[PDB]
Amino acid sequence: REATWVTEKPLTLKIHMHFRDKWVWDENWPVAREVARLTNVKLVGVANRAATNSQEQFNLMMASGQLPDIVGGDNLKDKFIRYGMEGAFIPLNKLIDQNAPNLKAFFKTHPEVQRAITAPDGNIYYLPYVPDGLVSRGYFIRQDWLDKLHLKTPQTVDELYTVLKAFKEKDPNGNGKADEIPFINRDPEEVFRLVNFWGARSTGSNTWMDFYVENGKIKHPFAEVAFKDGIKHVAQWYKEGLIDPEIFTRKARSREQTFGNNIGGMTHDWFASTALFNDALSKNIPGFKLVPMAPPINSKGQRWEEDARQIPRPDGWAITATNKNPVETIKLFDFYFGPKGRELSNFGVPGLTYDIKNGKPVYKDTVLKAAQPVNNQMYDIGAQIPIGFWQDYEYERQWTNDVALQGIDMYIKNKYVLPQFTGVNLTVEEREIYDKYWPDVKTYMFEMGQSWVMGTKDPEKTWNDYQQQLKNRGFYQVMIVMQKAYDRQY
Ligand SMILES: [Ca+2]
Asked: Which is it for strands 316-319 and 127-128: parallel, antiparallel or unpaired?
């Protein structure tokens, strides 16, 4: 008997949750048992641990003809809505308004999150995983090279050009050869992001080549004339050797390869993992210092950080039509948005993974010092999982190094991160058009982008034929769909 109990009579419900192509809900998790006793609702997992693909598992369940009481997982937003509109998942609007104080309070302060999870009919069919902290990537530069060469931190695009050229020509690594590669990136798509330096967008969100909104109008970065002008500049820098000539092929281990071999001078990547190269290289390469840099003022007079975390994520859980206890269930869901529920779902269980010190959750030293990443230690006990929960950045701050936090706090403070596109939820008919043409158009745009950057094709001479292919491949039909959907949802 707890003050937090959502029912006096103990309840057991079946949950089908498969995620990250490897994990499932485990009723034996310390976090699951804690929530169970605090709410009086226990969840039993019915998902398959042998599965290689989470989406396939959801499909088999939906097709089986039978349904559990709750369904959760990653990348299920579109399925929650499609099946929600067919009655498989119940709408949560009224249940929340009447039984979930924590959620309605949350939604009042986060109206954009509610808008992002709303289906074409106005119903909420699931609760999302809501990450905390918008800052994701940022620019990093070799401070030791700026120092060796007596250069000031570049404040504008042209000043940055001057710096990268010095890195290229003035032998900062001191081996007497011009082996330096000024800008490197493990993600080829980041070369497209450089058009930001000339006031052009490359994507509306963390998803590569995504649409963005400007004054209520949907636009795609790669179809804009501004992209044409901007990619010419990126192409010029590539021609001059300022960008890794292998930018489209090096990939995954680019940072290890280039910074490791002491030839990389700058990148744009996630603060935490990038800042850790200092730990690895501080001694190996005497004087090595890779540090966060504010984005330079672009050709339109603005400092842009186009990337940010997707908030909310297209992950979460929903209540099925077969669930005989919808009210008790929504109250369970609500528990996760209140203080205790939020603490547990973020940090684990007191005495096992953390302790409450002066009213605040602090990870145990063995947790912070373990070889296994904190994220994985949390998944192991039922925390940081893709159910409907409200992430707390404090948990991540506790395992992010100082160089990273110094840069993150600078980006937050100076407001460089641009407003993100949280996406639109489509109707079945709109989806059919999107799925038929978009995949191929996206592929084509990338191939064209690469050709222009590498100087294989000329943006000026091929722009019209490019736009013709866009029309022919259905780009504008997709654009019609997106705008209708945007107007309806926002
Ligand atoms: Ca050199």
From this structure: antiparallel
